[PDB]
Amino acid sequence: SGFRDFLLKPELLRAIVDCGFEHPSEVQHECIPQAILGMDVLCQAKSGMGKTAVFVLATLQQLEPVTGQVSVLVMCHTRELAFQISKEYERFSKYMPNVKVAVFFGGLSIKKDEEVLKKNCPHIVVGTPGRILALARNKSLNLKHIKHFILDECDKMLEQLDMRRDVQEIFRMTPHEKQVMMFSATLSKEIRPVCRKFMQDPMEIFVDDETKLTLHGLQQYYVKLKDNEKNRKLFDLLDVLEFNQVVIFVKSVQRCIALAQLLVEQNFPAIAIHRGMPQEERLSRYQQFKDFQRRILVATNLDIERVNIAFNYDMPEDSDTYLHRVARAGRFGTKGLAITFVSDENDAKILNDVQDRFEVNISELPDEIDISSY
Ligand SMILES: Nc1ncnc2c1ncn2[C@@H]1O[C@H](COP(=O)(O)OP(=O)(O)O)[C@@H](O)[C@H]1O
Ligand SMILES: [Mg+2]
Numbered sequence: 001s002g003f004r005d006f007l008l009k010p011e012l013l014r015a016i017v018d019c020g021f022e023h024p025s026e027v028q029h030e031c032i033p034q035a036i037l038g039m040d041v042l043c044q045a046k047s048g049m050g051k052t053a054v055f056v057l058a059t060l061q062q063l064e065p066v067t068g069q070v071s072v073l074v075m076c077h078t079r080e081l082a083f084q085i086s087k088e089y090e091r092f093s094k095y096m097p098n099v100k101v102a103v104f105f106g107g108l109s110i111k112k113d114e115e116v117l118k119k120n121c122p123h124i125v126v127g128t129p130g131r132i133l134a135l136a137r138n139k140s141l142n143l144k145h146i147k148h149f150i151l152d153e154c155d156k157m158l159e160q161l162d163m164r165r166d167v168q169e170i171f172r173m174t175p176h177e178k179q180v181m182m183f184s185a186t187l188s189k190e191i192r193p194v195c196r197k198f199m200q201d202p203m204e205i206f207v208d209d210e211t212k213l214t215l216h217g218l219q220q221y222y223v224k225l226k227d228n229e230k231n232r233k234l235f236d237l238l239d240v241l242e243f244n245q246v247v248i249f250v251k252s253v254q255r256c257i258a259l260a261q262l263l264v265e266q267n268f269p270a271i272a273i274h275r276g277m278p279q280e281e282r283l284s285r286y287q288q289f290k291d292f293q294r295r296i297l298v299a300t301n302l303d304i305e306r307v308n309i310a311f312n313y314d315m316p317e318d319s320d321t322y323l324h325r326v327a328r329a330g331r332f333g334t335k336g337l338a339i340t341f342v343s344d345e346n347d348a349k350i351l352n353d354v355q356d357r358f359e360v361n362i363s364e365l366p367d368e369i370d371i372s373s374y
Contacts, residue, residue, distance in 0.1 A: 025050035079105035
C-alpha cells in the first residue's frame, strides 16, 4: 500500500489491508502527514473524498493509552454520523485490543453512557455536542486529558447556533495545548472566524474534486414497464445480452435482498449488498464480485469495473445519483451499457432531467432482427 510512505504502526497497516484500502486518496496524502505529526489541521474537501480515515488513522497513530483517561474527542453533528465514526475507529483498532472506544448521543438514556464511563472508561470518545456537554457537566466525563479534539463536518455542526454554542463550551473544558483538527465539505458560509477560535495558526488545506465523472462512451437505454413486469424483463434480458458481470440497482434493502434471492433460485450467480449490511460484510461480498466468483451484483448503493452492463432496476433518486451509479470511470478505460427501468411519471421525470443535465439521449431498449453487441 501507499500508506507505508506514512509509516504507521504495523498493527495499523494491517487493519488497512483488511479494510480493502490499496492506495491513499488525495486528501489522505494531503492531510495525513501533518495530522500524524500533531499539527492543527483544517482539511476541507468535497464529500466522499476520504476525510474520516485521516483523523482516525492519525489519532490511532499518536494515541498513547492511559487507563482511566480519555485522550481523543471526536464530534459529529448527527448521531448517525458518530455511530459510523465509532465503527471506523473499531475497524482500524482491530489489531490494537488495548485501545477502547465508545459513542454517546442523545436519544438514549444518559445513565447508560455514565455506566460505560465508570465500568470501562474508553480512550477515544465519539458523539454529539449536546450529550458530550451533559456528561462533561455531570462530571462523568473528564475532558482535562484530551490531546486530540476533532470536529467532523464542522460546517454543518457549526452552522447550527445551539450546537455551535455547545462545541465552544466543550472546547473550553479541554486543555489548551492539544491537537485540534476540523474537516468540512465546504469552506463554509463564513465559519473561518469560529475556526480561528479553536486553532492556533492551523494549516488550511484544500483538495479539489478528484475525477469528474462523465457520461461519455456509454450506451444508455430505457425500458417502459409495470413493477409487476420488471422481473420477467430483467431475467429475459439476462438470457439475451452478453456480459461478464452486471450490477443492478434497487431502491430498498428489502427489494435488494429479494431479487438476488430470486436470481439464485433461477440459477444466476447473484450476490447482494445493501445499505443495512455492516462494512466488513460489504467488502466480503464485494470481494466475491471483484474476484469474479459471482457474476451479478444487486446493490442498493454504489473501482476497476469488470461490469459491462449497469441496471437501474428502479429509477435512481435524481440526476446525480444516476451519474454516480452508471458512469464507468474508476480505473481501466473502456465503454459500457446502461439500461434503466421506469414505471411511473416520477421515474420519467428523473430520466428526463438526465437527458437535460447531461445533453445526452436515452431511447427505448431495441433489438430488431439483430441484437446489440458491437
Ligand atoms: N484510501 C482509500 N481507499 C479505498 N477506500 C477508501 C479510502 N479511504 C476511504 N475509503 C472509503 O471510501 C469512503 C469515503 O471515506 P469517508 O472518510 O467517509 O469520506 P468523507 O468523510 O471525506 O466524505 C468510506 O466508505 C471509506 O471506507
Ligand atoms: Mg466526513
